[PDB]
Amino acid sequence: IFPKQYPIINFTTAGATVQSYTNFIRAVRGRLTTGADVHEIPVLPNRVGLPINQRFILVELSNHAELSVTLALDVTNAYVVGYRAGNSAYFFHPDNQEDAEAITHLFTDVQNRYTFAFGGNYDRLEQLAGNLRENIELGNGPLEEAISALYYYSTGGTQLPTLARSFIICIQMISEAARFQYIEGEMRTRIRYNRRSAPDPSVITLENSWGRLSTAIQESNQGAFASPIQLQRRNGSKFSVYDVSILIPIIALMVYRCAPPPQF
Numbered sequence: 001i002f003p004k005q006y007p008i009i010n011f012t013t014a015g016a017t018v019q020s021y022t023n024f025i026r027a028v029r030g031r032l033t034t035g036a037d038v039h040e041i042p043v044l045p046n047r048v049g050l051p052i053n054q055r056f057i058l059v060e061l062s063n064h065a066e067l068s069v070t071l072a073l074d075v076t077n078a079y080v081v082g083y084r085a086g087n088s089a090y091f092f093h094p095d096n097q098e099d100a101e102a103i104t105h106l107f108t109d110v111q112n113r114y115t116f117a118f119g120g121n122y123d124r125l126e127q128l129a130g131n132l133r134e135n136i137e138l139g140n141g142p143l144e145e146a147i148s149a150l151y152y153y154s155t156g157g158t159q160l161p162t163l164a165r166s167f168i169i170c171i172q173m174i175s176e177a178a179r180f181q182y183i184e185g186e187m188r189t190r191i192r193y194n195r196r197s198a199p200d201p202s203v204i205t206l207e208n209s210w211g212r213l214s215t216a217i218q219e220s221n222q223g224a225f226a227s228p229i230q231l232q233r234r235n236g237s238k239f240s241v242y243d244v245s246i247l248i249p250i251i252a253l254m255v256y257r258c259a260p261p262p263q264f
């Protein structure tokens with residue numbers, strides 16, 4: 001292995017149950033939060049001075065047909081940076097030159113290593129897939145199908161639109177699910193009923209507002225927000241948020257933003 005190991009968390013769509021999924025998601029959360037530094041919401045490590053040896057978390061997805069895919073998640077934002085399939089590695093275009101320095105410490109042992117011209121942002125992936133998030137069905141099935149698409153990509157199955165769609169599925173069911181309890185539950189309920197459904201406004205709005213929320217909550221004047229934030233209900237209606245309290249059972253993780261509160 002390359003100097004200093006990277007923690008791995010396994011999951012499989014074979015005997016996928018609400019229990020296994022919940023354990024998986026909570027395991028990811030439990031490893032992302034290196035320790036302290038939190039009102040009541042856990043904060044993610046600060047990229048500014050985070051050591052390479054503690055920069056990534058590996059998630060090994062296993063399919064019903066024994067098709068493994070190793071997804072690399074950035075511990076500072078819980079987002080997917082790239083993945084390994086067979087003897088190849090594919091990474092999303094490094095938005096920042098410093099991140100490139102980090103990426104080079106990932107799947108070093110692989111024969112083939114590639115880097116996409118596009119980034120990992122939904123807006124981009126959606127254009128490539130020609131499909132909005134509110135169209136792509138989520139659930140255990142879609143994830144199971146996503147694993148396969150990502151796998152055979154390294155051999156010829158490829159088909160860019162399919163590859164892009166698969167990423168949107170994985171990111172939401174893993175990254176987003178670990179970021180908000182709300183989204184975790186949405187995925188859990190789908191498994192609970194063996195269904196497949198596209199996320200509604202409530203889910204999308206949260207995802208699009210993750211950074212916004214993290215900032216506002218971390219910059220809350222003692223307890224209240226600077227200005228109220230408008231979210232969306234299931235039916236698409238919009239409501240205003242003023243405190244972090246109502247958000248406690250909704251949000252799980254936040255990305256580091258400013259000067260920490262004056263663990264002692």
Ligand SMILES: Nc1nc(O)c(N)c(O)n1
Pocket residue numbers: 077079119120121122123
């Ligand atoms: N849509 C989107 N793209 C990204 O690359 C990240 N890091 C994020 O949090 N959200």
